[PDB]
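Final report, results section. Input specification for complex C-07:
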Amino acid sequence: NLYFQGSHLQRNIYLSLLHMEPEEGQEKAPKVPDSVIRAALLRRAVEDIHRIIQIRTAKAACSTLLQRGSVGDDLWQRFLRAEKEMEDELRDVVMEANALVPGWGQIIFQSANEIAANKVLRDRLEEIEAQTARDKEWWEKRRATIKSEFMKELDAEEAVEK
Amino acid sequence: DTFTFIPLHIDPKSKAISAAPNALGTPSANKALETELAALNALHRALHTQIEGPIPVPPPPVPVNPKRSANINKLRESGNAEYRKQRYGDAIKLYTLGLQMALTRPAWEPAGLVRDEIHQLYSNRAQAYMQLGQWPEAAADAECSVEAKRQGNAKAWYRRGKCLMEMRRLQEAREWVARGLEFEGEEKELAELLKEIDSKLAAEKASRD
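Structure output:
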């Protein structure tokens, strides 16, 4: 319940889908399909991808911590502990996946990884595509001073002071 | 138990997951919950409508159904054919269709494939754009091309470079091409371009002083 990267939203949604409560007075478990549970687990897996890659990104980014005294060392140990905890989470997701569909836990994180990668790509692409409009307006305002090339041969009558 | 419970609602038939009224107590947390649930439902629909096999989970990514790739190839060469015939706008519509179909590949399928296909299509459409002199959009597409494939894609770097110098952003072009030479595709076209850029930079403000 305590994680290095905040409360696990996706995990909580998964486990809440499992332990559904009375929707109303009726005290009937509103039956949630296995397809939904599977989808939720896959979401959880994607989040886990982001988290583990974040931690391991830290480790390379934050290496010189080992050369910054006992405090940097303690922080590095923190990172290691975080990684191990997250690995435990990944294992749990794997065997949960196998329990849902036998053998699924062998590829669920391959699919999850690809999903994450695709998301990130889409985002970067989207800021690039977003810049284009204002780049156009800037270009239009800039090009106002540039001489027209169609039959540029003929030129403006030069100023002769008389 | 060992987690933070969230009250949820289920729509039968719709199969959709709804958030309880103020489930978490915080506007931020609640909005995050709503967006995540949106992604969840969307994923459910995706799994329901895009898994052709009998097993209702995504197949491993590495063996990939080559149909989509083939179609993308067809529209790509369609665009190229419309390009050689020097009617560029149509080639652009075709390239655009290619990008759309490439970017709508299921998310659990290899992202690197997507990167390949969209890199080439982005570069092509970029060139087609800078044939029509529409520089900003061309620079955009070329930038997307480089974003998809940074190395072994010197043509994209070149194209955005020339787009940048055409719309008088000479310093940006200088640095862009300069860094584009560090990642290595073929060099000397980028080298020619760079020599033109910094020669033009010297000549530009030798006249300022």
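The CA atoms of residues 17 and 72 of chain A lie 41 Å apart. The first helix of chain A runs from residue 9 to 18. This concludes the modelling results for the funded period.
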